[PDB]
Amino acid sequence: ASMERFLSVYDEVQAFLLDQLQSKYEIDPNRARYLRIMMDTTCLGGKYFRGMTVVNVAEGFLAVTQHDEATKERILHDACVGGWMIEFLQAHYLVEDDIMDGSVMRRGKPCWYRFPGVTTQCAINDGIILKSWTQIMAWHYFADRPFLKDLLCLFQKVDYATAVGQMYDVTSMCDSNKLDPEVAQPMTTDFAEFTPAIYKRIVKYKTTFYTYLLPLVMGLLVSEAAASVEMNLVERVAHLIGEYFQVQDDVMDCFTPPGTDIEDAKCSWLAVTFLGKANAAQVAEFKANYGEKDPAKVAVVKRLYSKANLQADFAAYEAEVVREVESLIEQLKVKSPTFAESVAVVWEKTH
Amino acid sequence: ASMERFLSVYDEVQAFLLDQLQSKYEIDPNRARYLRIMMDTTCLGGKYFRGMTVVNVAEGFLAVTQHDEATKERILHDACVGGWMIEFLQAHYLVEDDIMDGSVMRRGKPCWYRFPGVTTQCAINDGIILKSWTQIMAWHYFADRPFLKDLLCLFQKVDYATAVGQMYDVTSMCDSNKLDPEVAQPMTTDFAEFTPAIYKRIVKYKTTFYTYLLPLVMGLLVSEAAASVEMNLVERVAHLIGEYFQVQDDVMDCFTPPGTDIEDAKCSWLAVTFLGKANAAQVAEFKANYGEKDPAKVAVVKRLYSKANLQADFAAYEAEVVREVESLIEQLKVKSPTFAESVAVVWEKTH
């Protein structure tokens, strides 16, 4: 089974990283134990959607391509290592984002920096090490692979796009013309930048490149299958599915039982959609209550969202995405029914 | 002049990075201005010792190698880009380290995260972008270069060694056997881990790889001159000069007029050297006062250092380093008098 193989590769990669720290970086057993716990706490516990997508894509191509058994094993092992590079990249994002946002919990457990023996002083560096480990993995396991150059180049472009996206996200409640390192940033009063196009730019860069584009393209790279696809279509379908995924996360932050998007004045799908249909009085009530810690004001915003019938707007949004995704999957079938099926599976798991 | 060329390349690299953000990352003019100011504030103002070392090494080889004028220009341009990759890597370290340590000032100016319109929320991400820019630079300017693979591999090993070193440094006042993410870390009471070998490990990883090894090896890589050297000697001389550089920085933190190493209980050269010669009563007075914010206790520690005649220990340390560096430079002369002269210049600038 794919998951059994994926989890076995984690144990192998962890042992490699920790043994390398001992033989080449003069690490002592106690610091190796601290890093082992850090790696387990930050990398494990999720559903492994991103890492498993690499494995599923590679498995698809193995079913329709002739290979010796040793080659099939090498491809699957490469897909598992590539998948862990993405999972560790996500771990890096989550550790740093939780510190930047002053988050409390991450998956019903305290954020890494909040652990008593961690603290922000170590946690920022722990997040830096998580990302360095993605590169150590790549250079060690893929040293002689023909796809090494393409995989490293794609990985840094995705990483940089994600960092740019984090900047778009954290500055989404500022008026762009007021951005200035010398002057403390006031929250927007007109909310003129809370538009569908601006929201789409935040989501595209902060989530879609690493959650959807990177796992799909890595699966193609380790399979030596980039010719079975039109890269403009892969990008188009990844950004579309990714946007839908973030819209779902935005809805959950507000309505799923234990989120601080309202208090943080985030440019969420809910605030943008609400502002796109609100009358003069509703806009005024939104402005008087948004981006405030006061629970009474948060309740006013949630109530405005509830009475605005945003469930109908979400249903219409969902219908349009289902429509466009189905269209892109059909266009993907021209060059590869195998790859189009992997995308269909990713969509099913998202939808 | 080398410095004029180096500074002209900064303007070219900055324009490239910001133009790429506009054409490929959908950036708006205000966010591009914020990133331009961030880049200037974090990357400029220093002596450019690390970046200029790449240029000086390349200039040395140009004087003894036959090349067309266009090739000389390409090599110098590559040395300048490589030098800026190191300067931006340093900028990344300084931004993140200043946040982790809660530092106030950096070169008589507030630390980046302390700027009113920055804050920790943006500054951690700004430091991440500084490092991503080193990779964007490499992939764009060195895309067709034969040294691209070696340069990227060397750069990530150095970066990872530096992150490991930061961990060694920030945990240097903890008892290793007590390291535990679940338990708040008490400061050491016996100071058994304040030894020359442990101090040497901190310095080797936190400073020497990126300050001395990386600029020297990058200069060799852009010059296609790795055969003019024995890499074991380059590593040995880089770690030796690097250790001396950190010992100088440790002395300055305590005695150079405006440092918090004493209050932070850092495993500095001064604390290690003091403990290596102190009697029973002096050790007890050190333990009762070290790692405390109280200015009265800091003064007791400085006084213990002053009466311990650490200036004589520094003079004896300096004499041994001068001796060993001269020896290594002589061993470097066997394969390259040109490279040995560049190392002699680096030593002169350090000493």
Ligand SMILES: Nc1ccc(Oc2ccc(F)cc2)cn1
């Ligand atoms: N797999 C693994 C776990 C921990 C580890 O750390 C060590 C450090 C110094 C030693 F001397 C021995 C072990 C090395 N490898």
Ligand SMILES: Nc1ccc(Oc2ccc(F)cc2)cn1
């Ligand atoms: N859920 C999420 C939020 C933000 C994100 O992007 C970054 C995170 C930390 C960073 F340091 C840089 C980018 C990725 N995922």
Ligand SMILES: Nc1ccc(Oc2ccc(F)cc2)cn1
């Ligand atoms: N050299 C440079 C400086 C700033 C910059 O930012 C822009 C963003 C969006 C635009 F439409 C125009 C410029 C681009 N390049």
Ligand SMILES: Nc1ccc(Oc2ccc(F)cc2)cn1
């Ligand atoms: N002066 C100095 C201190 C520490 C240092 O290393 C790091 C810094 C930040 C990091 F996030 C990781 C490593 C480099 N230079």
Ligand SMILES: [Zn+2]
């Ligand atoms: Zn965030």
Ligand SMILES: [Zn+2]
């Ligand atoms: Zn520090």
